[PDB]
Every structure is written in C-alpha cells, then in structure tokens.
Amino acid sequence: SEQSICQARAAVMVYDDANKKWVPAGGSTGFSRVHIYHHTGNNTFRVVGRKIQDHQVVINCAIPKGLKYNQATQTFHQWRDARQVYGLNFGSKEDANVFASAMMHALEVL
Ligand SMILES: CC(=O)N[C@@H](Cc1ccccc1Cl)C(=O)N1CC[C@@H]2C=C[C@H]3CC[C@@H](C(=O)N4CC[C@@H]5C=C[C@H]6CC[C@@H](C(=O)O)N6C(=O)[C@H]54)N3C(=O)[C@H]21
DSSP: OEEEEEEEEEEEEEEETTTTEEEEGGGOOSOEEEEEEEETTTTEEEEEEEETTTOOEEEEEEOOTTOOOEEEETTEEEEEOSSOEEEEEESSHHHHHHHHHHHHHHHHHO
16 A cells, blocks of 8 residues: 655665764665655555665655654755664755655655
8 A cells, every 4th residue: 555656866874873973774885766655544654765786675764744854965864763863865966856855745744
C-alpha cells in the first residue's frame, strides 16, 4: 500500500554522537536512491533509501507530523530522530530540491 512520491540521489549519512562526526548510513559509502513513501491507508509517510549499486536499505525512517527539516546548504539537508541525526548529501541541487519539495508536501498534509 506504500507508494513512492519522489526519488533523489544522495549519500545518506548519520551523525555519530560518540565520535562527533558524520558517517555513512549503514556503514555503506556511496549514493542511494532516496524516496518518500506515502501509505494511503493511514496517511503516513516514511523516508526509504537504498544504495544505487547494491540496493541495500540504508535508511527507513518515519516522517511524523511536525518534523523539523533543516536545509543547511543547497545540497545537505538533515533532521533529528531520538537515536541520531540523519543527513542527505545530495548529488545535485536539483535532487535536493525535489526531495525537499516532497518532504514539505508530506509535512503540510500530516
Ligand atoms: C541546533 C542544532 O542542533 N542544529 C542542528 C541542525 C538542525 C537544525 C534544525 C532542525 C534539525 C537539525 Cl538536524 C545542527 O546544528 N546539527 C545537526 C548535527 C550536526 C553536526 C555537526 C555540525 C557540523 C557543522 C554542521 C554540519 O554538520 N554541516 C555544515 C553543513 C555541512 C554540509 C554537509 C555535511 C556532509 C557531511 C559533513 C561534511 O561535509 O564533512 N557535513 C557537514 O558538516 C554539514 N553541523 C550541524 O549542522 C549539526
């Protein structure tokens, strides 16, 4: 019942609080295809990203109502979760814009 509403090419990262540095999500360096999925049954949204080369899922995160999405630069956006900060380092400004527009839309309708 999940349907993709966008896809963007980005390096998915998480902030390692213990070592005070960004690290590749899933320990897997390289680019992912990152979607927002809309579950129409319960009007929920999630971020799901899979490595482009090997298809491993490296991020699967809820988008709750009120999520604060920080566009730090034209190609790096980030948001908080209880466990860690997530980051998307986009391949292009246009990838970043298409993803942010889909995120904005999800946040407006939640
Ligand atoms: C008030 C508050 O806690 N605010 C949070 C942000 C926030 C605000 C509102 C809602 C949600 C969130 Cl999430 C916060 O300040 N956080 C999130 C944790 C992040 C960590 C470190 C420092 C290092 C300085 C900055 C940083 O990360 N920045 C600069 C752009 C820069 C661009 C790309 C990424 C790519 C990986 C790394 C690099 O290239 O080496 N890198 C970067 O180096 C990237 N920052 C942050 O950004 C920090």
